[PDB]
Amino acid sequence: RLKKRIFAAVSEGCVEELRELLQDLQDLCRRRRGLDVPDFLMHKLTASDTGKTCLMKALLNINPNTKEIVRILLAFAEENDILDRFINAEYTEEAYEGQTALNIAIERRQGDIT
Amino acid sequence: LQRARTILEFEKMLPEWLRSRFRMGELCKVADEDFRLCLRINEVKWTEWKTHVSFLNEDPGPI
């Protein structure tokens, strides 16, 4: 149920709730076999039915504190060496195939986040 | 206005089981614990550009 509280906090704009869910995600991953840890951490931040990431979920819901949230998710993925595949993930369903996070930020008219 | 009077007069002489077959609108959840029958209309507007905040669905396709 760590996946549910991250997608909910990233939509509403809960900064202090989000940092604590990420640190508990840091703790669950460090006690592991250590074989496919980048495959395990992208399994948590992605809805399995659509391919939507928590970065996409924030950009679809523009808040008064959106620009602070995006900096938290990018600084988190950088220290786990997955900044490339986190920022270039795509939708997988046939309705929205190919849509990325840069696509969402332009449509929502977010000139600073782009 | 003349054709509208013809339509409503035809509608009153239908049996009640056949009134249920021809049903305008769809049942939609517009708020928390609030279910209303609604009619859908599409629109294209090129002049007022705004960031979209208020919506019922994040995913914009026919679902």
UniProtKB/Swiss-Prot annotation, chain A:
<protein>
    <recommendedName>
        <fullName>Transient receptor potential cation channel subfamily V member 3</fullName>
    </recommendedName>
</protein>
<comment type="function">
    <text>Non-selective calcium permeant cation channel. It is activated by innocuous (warm) temperatures and shows an increased response at noxious temperatures greater than 39 degrees Celsius. Activation exhibits an outward rectification. The channel pore can dilate to provide permeability to larger cations. May associate with TRPV1 and may modulate its activity. Is a negative regulator of hair growth and cycling: TRPV3-coupled signaling suppresses keratinocyte proliferation in hair follicles and induces apoptosis and premature hair follicle regression (catagen).</text>
</comment>
<feature type="repeat" description="ANK 1">
    <location>
        <begin position="1"/>
        <end position="31"/>
    </location>
</feature>
<feature type="repeat" description="ANK 3">
    <location>
        <begin position="97"/>
        <end position="114"/>
    </location>
</feature>
<comment type="subunit">
    <text>Homotetramer. May convert from a homotetramer to a homopentamer to allow pore dilation. Interacts with TRPV1; may form a heteromeric channel with TRPV1. Interacts with SNX11; this interaction promotes TRPV3 trafficking from the cell membrane to lysosome for degradation.</text>
</comment>
<comment type="similarity">
    <text>Belongs to the transient receptor (TC 1.A.4) family. TrpV subfamily. TRPV3 sub-subfamily.</text>
</comment>
<feature type="repeat" description="ANK 2">
    <location>
        <begin position="53"/>
        <end position="81"/>
    </location>
</feature>
